[PDB]
């Protein structure tokens, strides 16, 4: 088990790198073909409130 | 004087780049490999049970190298991706 733990740790990190890359890369299908924009009527308001939070303070938001 | 600066401009030599932008992705990948092939040894050293002074020494000595290599890969990769310097 002396040489096992290290192998399992390295493999548990390679697997998570691959998992992150397969989760992030499988969603960028509407950003490659079409410019990065905000889809869906509802998210627009969230975007406008995030712009209002990053332009004004937290107290004003 | 605009006339003398405009005279000095044309006379001088052109700009030769340090490393051409066409061969930077190669260095990007060949540095990304090394900067993690080394920084894993750092975590193995810190994890390993040994003298504190020896652990510190064999951590920093091969952490500085990984630092330099990562700080020189993150420029070639950034140029290769289209966001220069």
């Amino acid at each position: 088990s002396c040489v096992l733990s290290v192998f399992q740790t390295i493999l548990k990190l390679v697997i998570f790198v691959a998992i992150f890359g397969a989760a992030i890369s499988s969603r960028l299908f509407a950003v490659i073909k079409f410019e990065s924009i905000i889809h869906e009527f509802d998210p627009w308001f969230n975007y406008r409130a995030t712009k209002y939070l990053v332009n004004n303070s937290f107290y004003k938001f | 004087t605009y006339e003398q600066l405009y005279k000095e401009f044309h006379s001088s030599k052109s700009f030769q780049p340090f490393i051409h932008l066409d061969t930077q992705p190669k260095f990007a990948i060949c540095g990304l490999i090394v900067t993690l092939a080394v920084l894993s040894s750092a975590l193995f050293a810190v994890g390993s049970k040994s003298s504190y002074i020896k652990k510190l020494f064999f951590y920093t000595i091969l952490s500085v190298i990984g630092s330099l290599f990562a700080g020189l890969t993150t420029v070639f990769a950034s140029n290769s991706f289209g966001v220069y310097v």
Binding site: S26, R27, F29, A30, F41, W44 | -
Partner: protein, 158 residues
């Protein structure tokens, strides 16, 4: 999105976890522990609430995975433990089928995302964009304090 939904839309966005899901629930029922009761209650509640209403399928998606992995992982252990060609052949035949299912799972969950869900909602690909043109007209050529009256499902965009 406030409706019920038929059975195809369950195989659509869960390739083969949908028939390991009852297996996972049963294999949790076999040896009940403290947390298995939580997982079972979560599973049954989200299953019923997703069968009734389709907006709540997202909440059911975690328990489809966690219940399925427990059902699948056990199989692998039994068939991946090497502790005799006549037995290794059976082990390989039983594990290769499930690796093949895992690969069809990837080839399905990539095709579905490529085809259905990755569709821009502001530019019809038939590439026509007449919403952004009119909205930019209103933004450029009308004074800043003017009021626009439209039906309620465009206001956010406006």
């Amino acid at each position: 999105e406030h409706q019920p939904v038929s059975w195809p839309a369950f195989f659509f966005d869960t390739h083969f976890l949908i028939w390991l899901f009852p297996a996972g629930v049963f294999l949790l029922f076999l040896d009940l522990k403290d947390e298995h009761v939580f997982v079972i209650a979560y599973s049954v509640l989200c299953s019923y609430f997703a069968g009734v209403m389709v907006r709540l399928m997202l909440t059911l998606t975690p328990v489809i995975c966690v219940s399925a992995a427990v059902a699948l992982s056990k199989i692998f252990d039994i068939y991946l433990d090497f502790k005799k060609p006549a037995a290794l052949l059976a082990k390989l035949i039983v594990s290769g089928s499930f690796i093949f299912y895992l690969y069809l799972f990837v080839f399905h969950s990539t095709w579905v995302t490529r085809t259905a869900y990755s569709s821009p909602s502001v530019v019809l690909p038939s590439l026509i964009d007449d919403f952004r043109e009119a909205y930019y007209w209103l933004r450029m050529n009308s004074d800043e304090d003017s009021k626009v009256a439209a039906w309620w499902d465009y206001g956010y965009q406006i």
